[PDB]
Amino acid sequence: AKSAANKLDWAKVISSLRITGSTATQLSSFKKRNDEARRQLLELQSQPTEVDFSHYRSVLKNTSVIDKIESYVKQYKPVKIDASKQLQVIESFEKHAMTNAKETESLVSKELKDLQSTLDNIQSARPFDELTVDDLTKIKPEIDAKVEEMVKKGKWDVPGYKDRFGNLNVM
């Protein structure tokens, strides 16, 4: 069921709009796919890891080495072992990845909550008509300081203080 194993990564790439830019994760996906490709190639192209000693040695009447060749073959049943040395590296990688991803997910949930509440404090909580003018310096802590700072040094103008407003003449 190797479809599912890459199905998660394919779905992630389908939703990697926040995950686009993976510098060293696509390389890992390439490594995983190369491992599967070499595995399927070993399975298909290479014959059985065995010897057709049932008849092939008989076709060689005086081989005098088919016995020796089969002896080496059977005695070379384990040429070597597998290497599943990933037993603490896997744990450390899992710990780092899981802690980072949990921090990311909690941050995302908190951002969702903050946006939802601020919008709830926006869809009906923006008193644009009857809010006290100086209360803006109450809502904006630097508004009072800067406004005192803005007129204090002597300049009575700001860069485009009325960029979206009109100055108007007497009429």
Binding site: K2, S3, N6, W10, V13, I14
Partner: protein, 337 residues
Amino acid sequence: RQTGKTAVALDTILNQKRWNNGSDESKKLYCVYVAVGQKRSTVAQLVQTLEQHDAMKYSIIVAATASEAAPLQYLAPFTAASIGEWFRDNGKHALIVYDDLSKQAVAYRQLSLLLRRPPGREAYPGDVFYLHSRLLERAAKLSEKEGSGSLTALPVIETQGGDVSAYIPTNVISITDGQIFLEAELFYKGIRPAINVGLSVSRVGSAAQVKALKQVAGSLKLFLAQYREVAAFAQFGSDLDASTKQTLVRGERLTQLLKQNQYSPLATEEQVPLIYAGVNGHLDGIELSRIGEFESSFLSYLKSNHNELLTEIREKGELSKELLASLKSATESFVAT
């Protein structure tokens, strides 16, 4: 010369491993190639290519060396006919593929013009058509009265300069029911197969076609004919509209796709897929050059991911609208990853 039409034959033979190598007589098409007048080194190459891909289990290759004498080469096609009778007449569906038959004609020329018989048309012996027919006409598809067996034949003729217009070539093209023309340009221009799709034709497209390629993809066959006609006009005409340009780009991607690589016979699984995706806009959106690997990836995805649907398309004998939808899903998956 050296057009590898012999290789087209060899690949055609290798398909006697995905059905013949099973156990199905109804799927069995026990091919018997021929070797009429070829350099014995080429014979060795053929034998090795038969053994390595495990073809010699299903192909009897009667041989006639160039170093061999003229009567041998002349009689060889008759020997292949005899083998075809011995197989097909038994009642199992069998096949044949005569080798380069132009050498057989040259042998008949030697036999006639050398013994005493006056020459005929094109300086070749008069009964060239007689011999050619007596070879090809042996092949047929008998009825259940004779066992419903058949000896399908793929006689191979050779010209000089790809000459369709020749005594032996044109006369044979009257005798054989199908033609697949291999050019000189395309043989160096754009395709390892280099089969002139427009020029090639067979007198039975509907009856006896891959039920996958017609029963569902019959519209795909008409689209093959239509896109071939489309690419026929794609030389120096302007861009009248966008419809013609779109047809040109999609059909050209299809042509760059359709060449089944040498000694790589793998068919009745996603045949329609190319034209269906082109009209449904799955492969056509890919780059034309990249298709050379995109097709391989799509096939492997159908194999290890759409295994049920692909295996059914192999076995169910048709690509149903439901199987068309599942293949569309697999096509979306191939487009995605």
